[PDB]
């Protein structure tokens, strides 16, 4: 897809990708908590990342809004919504992108940058 | 050929705003001198760390004179010291390397400047005669 | 499908811009596309779906190659024929000195541009010593002859043995 930044890397780090999901991955069986697979989204090295964590994560979320715009624009078999992630405490704006597939699987996208470690070490 | 040097000003008094006296500086010289710094690097260290226009303005003597009077005069003039140090170090680079014929041309240009300076200093008697740098 | 392209320095540019319409006519003789990009300084020859023969595009490559070496355009359009062979030999890689490159360069070109043109009487070719190359067009036998003469002349072999050589050979084929 064409974005304001070219895609650096998209990394699957879900448990099903390392064969550790307690239930085997069943299509459309979302009642099990192992269903949504965690995927890191890393964009290219760029100075477009603000030096404050709220504007950083909201910038990530607005990038996920543009990806949701292209995705709902041209990938109508896929489904998608947005969720919160309070499993990182006090970082109240991490929004995961949830995509439901016609193979019966669900993923979530969360953006990692280079500006994260500097701001957290600064904190 | 390349013109590059220091242009001292017109007025040989200075600076009409400096506060301290020469006694502040004369003490400052000898401690730097006994520390082990060369009289070239003294006037390096004087002009930039503190504010002095030139040490021969606040003091009516040369900086070499103050080391000569207070008993800090070295064995030789300071310029010939480095020409000794350069001549050994190239020779030391030649005792490791027998192939660098480019270096062997450079030794004579060192030695001939050493020779012509040796005749002057031994004539004007900062060095005793029969002295030789081999 | 196949797409070839090349570049030029700036002392060919405005001239190429003045002859680009006859470029697209002569290339339009064989259904060849060409694109002139100023911002890179690149010419680009391509084939289309309405193409007839593929092999002609190789000649197209040669032509834009022959516009990198400042050959006059009416002399240049001969290579789109069939019985017309091209050659680009690089003369930059023979002398480390600039002065002795100049020595056998000028001994090659001779007084007043005579001797060089004498070869073009005994080869019936076209020869352009373009700076750091020899660019030679013409028939194939002549490209053998000019390749032998140049690749002897950058070294210490004199041109007079070559022009006596081709002179005696053409006069013995006269017979």
């Amino acid at each position: 897809m064409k974005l304001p930044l070219s895609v650096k890397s998209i990394l699957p780090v879900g448990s099903a990708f390392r064969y550790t999901s307690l239930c085997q991955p069943v299509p459309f069986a979302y009642s099990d908590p192992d269903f949504f697979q965690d995927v890191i989204l890393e964009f290219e090295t760029s100075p477009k990342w603000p030096d404050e964590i709220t504007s950083l994560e909201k910038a990530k979320t607005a990038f996920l809004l543009k990806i949701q715009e292209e995705l709902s624009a041209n990938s109508s078999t896929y489904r998608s919504f947005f969720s919160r992630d309070e499993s990182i405490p006090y970082n109240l704006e991490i929004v995961t992108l949830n995509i439901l597939t016609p193979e019966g699987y669900g993923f979530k996208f969360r953006v990692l940058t280079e500006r994260d470690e500097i701001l957290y070490l600064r904190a | 050929k390349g013109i590059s040097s220091s242009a001292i000003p017109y007025s040989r008094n200075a600076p009409a705003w400096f506060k301290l006296s020469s006694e502040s500086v004369i003490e400052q010289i000898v401690k730097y001198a006994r520390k082990g710094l060369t009289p070239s690097q003294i006037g390096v260290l004087l002009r930039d760390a503190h504010g002095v226009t030139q040490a021969r303005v606040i003091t009516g003597n040369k900086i070499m004179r103050i080391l000569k009077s207070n008993g800090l005069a070295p064995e030789i003039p300071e310029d010939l010291y480095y020409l000794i140090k350069k001549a050994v170090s190239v020779r030391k680079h030649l005792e490791r390397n027998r192939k660098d014929k480019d270096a062997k041309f450079r030794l004579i240009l060192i030695e001939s400047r050493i020779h012509r300076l040796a005749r002057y200093y031994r004539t004007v008697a900062v060095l005793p005669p029969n002295w030789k740098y081999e | 499908e196949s797409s070839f392209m090349t570049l030029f320095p700036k002392y060919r540019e405005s001239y190429l811009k003045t002859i680009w319409n006859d470029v697209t006519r002569a290339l339009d003789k064989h259904n060849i596309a060409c694109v002139l990009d100023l911002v890179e300084g690149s010419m680009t020859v391509k084939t289309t779906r309405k193409t007839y023969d593929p092999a002609i595009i190789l000649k197209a490559r040669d032509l834009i190659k022959l516009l990198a070496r400042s050959v006059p355009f009416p002399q240049a359009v001969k290579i789109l024929q069939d019985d017309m062979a091209c050659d680009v030999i690089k003369i930059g890689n023979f002398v480390t000195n600039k002065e002795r490159f100049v020595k056998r360069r000028q001994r090659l070109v001779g007084p007043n541009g005579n001797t060089l043109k004498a070869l073009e009487l005994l080869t019936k070719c076209y020869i352009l010593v373009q700076g750091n190359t020899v660019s030679a067009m013409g028939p194939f036998k002549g490209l053998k002859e000019v390749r032998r003469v140049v690749e002897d002349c950058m070294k210490n072999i004199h041109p007079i043995y070559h022009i006596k050589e081709l002179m005696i050979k053409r006069e013995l084929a006269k017979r």
Binding site: - | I3, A7, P9, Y10, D48, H50, G51 | -
Partner: protein, 79 residues
């Protein structure tokens, strides 16, 4: 296009420092305020050394070939 007696200071100041009528320097002094302390030191405009402050021995300026770079902790008076 001029006489050698008095040229203008606009014509004079563009010239090389040696080739003037009366040769004189162009380099200057300044006072250095770095808030680790409040004492100023007279630092010559061209360093040749790594210079630190009087008591807060951290940095004042960095050596270059030409003019030294005052390392941003400074407002100054050229006197």
């Amino acid at each position: 296009v001029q006489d050698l007696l008095h040229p203008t200071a606009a014509s004079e100041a563009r010239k090389h420092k040696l080739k003037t009528l009366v040769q004189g320097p162009r380099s200057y002094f300044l006072d250095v305020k770095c808030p680790g302390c409040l004492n100023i030191t007279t630092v010559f405009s061209h360093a040749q050394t790594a210079v630190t402050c009087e008591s807060c021995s951290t940095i004042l300026c960095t050596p270059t070939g030409g003019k030294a770079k005052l390392s941003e902790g400074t407002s100054f008076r050229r006197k």
